[PDB]
Design a protein around this motif. Structure first.
Motif, PDB file in Angstrom:
ATOM      1  N   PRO A   1       0.799  -1.237   0.000  1.00 13.86           N
ATOM      2  CA  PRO A   1       0.000   0.000   0.000  1.00 13.86           C
ATOM      3  C   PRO A   1       0.837   1.297   0.000  1.00 13.86           C
ATOM      4  O   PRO A   1       0.260   2.373  -0.153  1.00 13.86           O
ATOM      5  CB  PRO A   1      -0.827  -0.077   1.303  1.00 13.86           C
ATOM      6  N   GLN A   2       2.149   1.214   0.175  1.00 14.08           N
ATOM      7  CA  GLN A   2       3.003   2.397  -0.073  1.00 14.08           C
ATOM      8  C   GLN A   2       3.315   2.561  -1.570  1.00 14.08           C
ATOM      9  O   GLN A   2       3.420   3.678  -2.086  1.00 14.08           O
ATOM     10  CB  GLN A   2       4.328   2.327   0.691  1.00 14.08           C
ATOM     11  N   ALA A   3       3.411   1.452  -2.267  1.00 11.17           N
ATOM     12  CA  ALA A   3       3.808   1.470  -3.653  1.00 11.17           C
ATOM     13  C   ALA A   3       2.649   1.542  -4.641  1.00 11.17           C
ATOM     14  O   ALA A   3       2.798   2.109  -5.724  1.00 11.17           O
ATOM     15  CB  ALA A   3       4.646   0.247  -3.948  1.00 11.17           C
ATOM     16  N   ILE A   4       1.516   0.928  -4.292  1.00  4.66           N
ATOM     17  CA  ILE A   4       0.393   0.819  -5.200  1.00  4.66           C
ATOM     18  C   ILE A   4      -0.775   1.555  -4.568  1.00  4.66           C
ATOM     19  O   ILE A   4      -1.281   1.146  -3.490  1.00  4.66           O
ATOM     20  CB  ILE A   4       0.036  -0.642  -5.483  1.00  4.66           C
ATOM     21  N   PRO A   5      -1.179   2.663  -5.194  1.00 11.45           N
ATOM     22  CA  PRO A   5      -2.224   3.504  -4.604  1.00 11.45           C
ATOM     23  C   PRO A   5      -3.606   2.848  -4.687  1.00 11.45           C
ATOM     24  O   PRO A   5      -3.878   2.046  -5.592  1.00 11.45           O
ATOM     25  CB  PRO A   5      -2.170   4.777  -5.455  1.00 11.45           C
ATOM     26  N   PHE A   6      -4.468   3.194  -3.732  1.00  8.82           N
ATOM     27  CA  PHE A   6      -5.893   2.914  -3.839  1.00  8.82           C
ATOM     28  C   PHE A   6      -6.456   4.029  -4.737  1.00  8.82           C
ATOM     29  O   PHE A   6      -6.145   5.217  -4.535  1.00  8.82           O
ATOM     30  CB  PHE A   6      -6.593   2.946  -2.468  1.00  8.82           C
ATOM     31  N   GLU A   7      -7.226   3.652  -5.756  1.00  3.16           N
ATOM     32  CA  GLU A   7      -7.872   4.650  -6.618  1.00  3.16           C
ATOM     33  C   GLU A   7      -8.973   3.996  -7.453  1.00  3.16           C
ATOM     34  O   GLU A   7      -8.901   2.809  -7.766  1.00  3.16           O
ATOM     35  CB  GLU A   7      -6.822   5.405  -7.522  1.00  3.16           C
TER      36      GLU A   7
ATOM     37  N   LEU B   1      -8.923   3.453   4.821  1.00  2.00           N
ATOM     38  CA  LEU B   1      -7.816   3.413   5.772  1.00  2.00           C
ATOM     39  C   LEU B   1      -7.017   2.140   5.554  1.00  2.00           C
ATOM     40  O   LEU B   1      -7.396   1.074   6.060  1.00  2.00           O
ATOM     41  CB  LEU B   1      -8.372   3.397   7.216  1.00  2.00           C
ATOM     42  N   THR B   2      -5.902   2.205   4.826  1.00  4.11           N
ATOM     43  CA  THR B   2      -5.257   0.950   4.451  1.00  4.11           C
ATOM     44  C   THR B   2      -4.446   0.296   5.572  1.00  4.11           C
ATOM     45  O   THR B   2      -3.571   0.905   6.156  1.00  4.11           O
ATOM     46  CB  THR B   2      -4.392   1.133   3.212  1.00  4.11           C
ATOM     47  N   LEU B   3      -4.773  -0.946   5.882  1.00  6.09           N
ATOM     48  CA  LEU B   3      -3.983  -1.710   6.821  1.00  6.09           C
ATOM     49  C   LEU B   3      -2.555  -1.961   6.263  1.00  6.09           C
ATOM     50  O   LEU B   3      -2.398  -2.307   5.065  1.00  6.09           O
ATOM     51  CB  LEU B   3      -4.723  -3.005   7.029  1.00  6.09           C
ATOM     52  N   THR B   4      -1.543  -1.838   7.119  1.00  4.24           N
ATOM     53  CA  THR B   4      -0.148  -1.995   6.697  1.00  4.24           C
ATOM     54  C   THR B   4       0.555  -3.151   7.409  1.00  4.24           C
ATOM     55  O   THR B   4       1.777  -3.275   7.369  1.00  4.24           O
ATOM     56  CB  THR B   4       0.652  -0.642   6.864  1.00  4.24           C
ATOM     57  N   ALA B   5      -0.221  -4.015   8.049  1.00  4.61           N
ATOM     58  CA  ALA B   5       0.319  -5.241   8.603  1.00  4.61           C
ATOM     59  C   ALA B   5      -0.790  -6.280   8.653  1.00  4.61           C
ATOM     60  O   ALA B   5      -1.956  -5.894   8.782  1.00  4.61           O
ATOM     61  CB  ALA B   5       0.859  -4.996  10.024  1.00  4.61           C
TER      62      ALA B   5
ATOM     63  N   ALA C   1      -6.044   6.760  -2.094  1.00  5.51           N
ATOM     64  CA  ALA C   1      -5.240   6.684  -0.910  1.00  5.51           C
ATOM     65  C   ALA C   1      -3.886   6.078  -1.208  1.00  5.51           C
ATOM     66  O   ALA C   1      -3.710   5.325  -2.155  1.00  5.51           O
ATOM     67  CB  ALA C   1      -6.007   5.891   0.236  1.00  5.51           C
ATOM     68  N   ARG C   2      -2.915   6.417  -0.384  1.00  4.68           N
ATOM     69  CA  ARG C   2      -1.602   5.807  -0.471  1.00  4.68           C
ATOM     70  C   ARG C   2      -0.968   5.896   0.915  1.00  4.68           C
ATOM     71  O   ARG C   2      -1.129   6.905   1.617  1.00  4.68           O
ATOM     72  CB  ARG C   2      -0.743   6.513  -1.542  1.00  4.68           C
TER      73      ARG C   2
ATOM     74  N   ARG D   1      -0.261   8.894   6.056  1.00  3.83           N
ATOM     75  CA  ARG D   1      -1.187   8.272   5.106  1.00  3.83           C
ATOM     76  C   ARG D   1      -1.794   9.400   4.271  1.00  3.83           C
ATOM     77  O   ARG D   1      -2.051  10.457   4.799  1.00  3.83           O
ATOM     78  CB  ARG D   1      -2.337   7.625   5.862  1.00  3.83           C
ATOM     79  N   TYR D   2      -2.034   9.177   2.986  1.00 10.51           N
ATOM     80  CA  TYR D   2      -2.745  10.162   2.167  1.00 10.51           C
ATOM     81  C   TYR D   2      -4.111   9.633   1.896  1.00 10.51           C
ATOM     82  O   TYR D   2      -4.273   8.412   1.606  1.00 10.51           O
ATOM     83  CB  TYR D   2      -2.052  10.393   0.814  1.00 10.51           C
TER      84      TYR D   2
END
Length: 267
Positions: free
Chosen positions: A32-38, A128-132, A206-207, A213-214
């Motif tokens: 989720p840092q590399a591939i944006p939600f859109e 709100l992207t989970l990162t773990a 989002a990213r 977080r954006y």
């Protein structure tokens, strides 16, 4: 035929290739840092294809992003290629305000079985992207590279929640019913084509980053620090924010500015 090499390059992952918890955690953080939600494609009235060749073409080779099915199908294939035991789940979105008491099962996540323990994984939640990855253990508060999360157990579902602003806020609710590609393809069709989908009437992006977080919803940009708000006033500004700030591809700029006017996102 999934191109694991290309996928790990797309997400900047150079670590060991194995089916370990350490790997799952590094992938869940990097993706989720590399591939944006859109939802650029649905917003422009273009189809979202979920088949694996189409996903790699768009996201891996083409450098684009996607929404939940695109993110999590992709993550699932990669995890499967690394040797993880993984299944699809579906969730009803609780984040924000709905006109339904019960919302549709519009979101996809994943279950991952590691040494006989169940984790959930979800690199595709737009709110709100989970990162773990998270252990499926009700009550337990779990640290991530960003917010704490927890799963709570209700009568006949689990609710995933995040600690935001001193409150536990519910993202979505799910059970353990397995989902296959055919199931997602039905929901995907609804979300990317129904005039009733919010994925058609507005821009949602989002990213994740290391320190922040954006989040963009319509004309509201939020940066959540480990919370700046900008209201975007024009189509050109929206497009520059998407392309510049968020690293999102707009494949047809004039159709974009034309849709922004029809939906009055900026008006």
């Amino acid at each position: 035929p999934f191109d694991l090499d290309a996928y790990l390059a797309r997400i900047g992952y150079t670590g060991p290739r194995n089916a370990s918890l350490d790997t799952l955690k590094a992938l869940h953080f990097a993706h989720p840092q590399a591939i944006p939600f859109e939802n650029i494609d649905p917003f422009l009235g273009r189809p979202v294809r979920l088949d694996l060749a189409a996903l790699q073409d768009k996201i891996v080779l083409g450098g684009r992003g996607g929404y939940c099915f695109e993110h999590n199908l992709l993550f699932m294939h990669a995890l499967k290629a690394l040797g993880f035991e993984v299944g699809g789940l579906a969730a009803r979105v609780l984040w924000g305000q709905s006109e339904d008491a019960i919302t549709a099962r519009s979101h996809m996540l994943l279950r991952v079985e590691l040494d006989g323990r169940t984790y959930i994984a979800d690199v595709g939640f737009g709110g709100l992207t989970l990162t773990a990855p998270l252990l499926l253990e009700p009550g337990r508060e779990q640290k991530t590279p960003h917010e704490p999360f927890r799963i709570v157990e209700a009568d006949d579902h689990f609710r995933l929640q995040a600690a935001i602003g001193g409150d536990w806020r519910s993202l979505y609710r799910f059970d353990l019913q397995p989902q296959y590609e055919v199931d997602y393809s039905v929901t995907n069709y609804f979300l990317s084509t129904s005039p009733t989908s919010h994925f058609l009437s507005s821009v949602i992006a989002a990213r994740a980053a290391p320190d922040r977080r954006y989040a963009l919803r319509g004309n509201r940009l939020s940066i959540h620090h480990l919370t700046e708000q900008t209201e975007i006033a024009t189509a050109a500004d929206l497009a520059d924010t998407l392309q510049g700030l968020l690293g999102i591809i707009i494949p047809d700029r004039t159709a974009f500015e034309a849709k922004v006017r029809e939906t009055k996102i900026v008006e």
